[PDB]
């Protein structure tokens with residue numbers, strides 16, 4: 001789809017995320033060209049699975065604590081596309097339950113920014 | 117133009133920014149569909165400029181002091197357009213002097229995300 005851009009309305013998509021540690025869930029995610037790597041809420045993973053420690057710099061400062069890194073690839077299905085996005089690794093939000101589609105996923109989408 | 121999306125390459129643009137507190141200056145900004153509001157460096161202003169205090173939520177945390185709000189509109193010229201973008205207010209990065217074009221600016225550009 002062509003997705004308009006409006007400061008008042010977050011550009012969002014429904015995505016089916018498979019962490020390969022539990023059952024795939026459909027979630028609302030932010031479409032974010034400023035994000036190097038996709039961010040999945042920890043709730044989509046099983047309590048036991050191993051995650052990796054990581055340090056993340058973003059607008060609020062630097063955090064050692066808030067995000068982890070996955071140990072398995074993550075599979076993402078977007079409504080219009082039959083072919084699943086395959087992410088070797090992404091970030092995992094242990095706190096604020098953020099779901100954010102970054103440029104790693106948008107690349108495999110063939111997503112572009114267009115400014116006339 | 118059409119900007120392709122790549123996790124290994126930040127989509128950046130050259131932008132002439134006018135704070136209305138000195139002369140127009142060129143910066144390199146990140147084109148960011150996850151940004152509610154535009155972010156410009158404090159380095160554009162002289163030491164003594166009236167800015168407002170503000171609270172900002174990012175991936176690094178909530179911060180009540182890294183960012184200020186401008187008192188006057190900001191004028192922004194992009195290479196591929198003649199008419200300036202005029203933002204009524206925007207964010208000022210006092211900490212890391214980041215430069216981020218957000219959805220406020222992208223709306224005045226008729227910028228879109230396109231996913232095939």
Ligand SMILES: CC(C)[C@@H](C)NC(=O)[C@H]1N(C(=O)[C@@H](O)[C@H](Cc2ccccc2)NC(=O)[C@@H](NC(=O)[C@@H](N)c2ccccc2)C(C)(C)C)CSC1(C)C
Nearest residue numbers: 032034035036037056057058059150151152153173174175
């Ligand atoms: C998201 C991760 C991959 C992280 C490592 N990367 C980054 O964060 C990169 N950025 C991005 O990826 C941006 O699109 C972020 C996305 C974000 C928004 C709220 C909580 C968490 C993440 N946007 C912001 O930080 C922006 N904050 C907002 O727009 C704020 N109003 C907000 C609060 C809750 C939910 C949506 C929006 C500002 C400060 C730039 C205006 C801006 S700074 C960055 C390093 C270039």
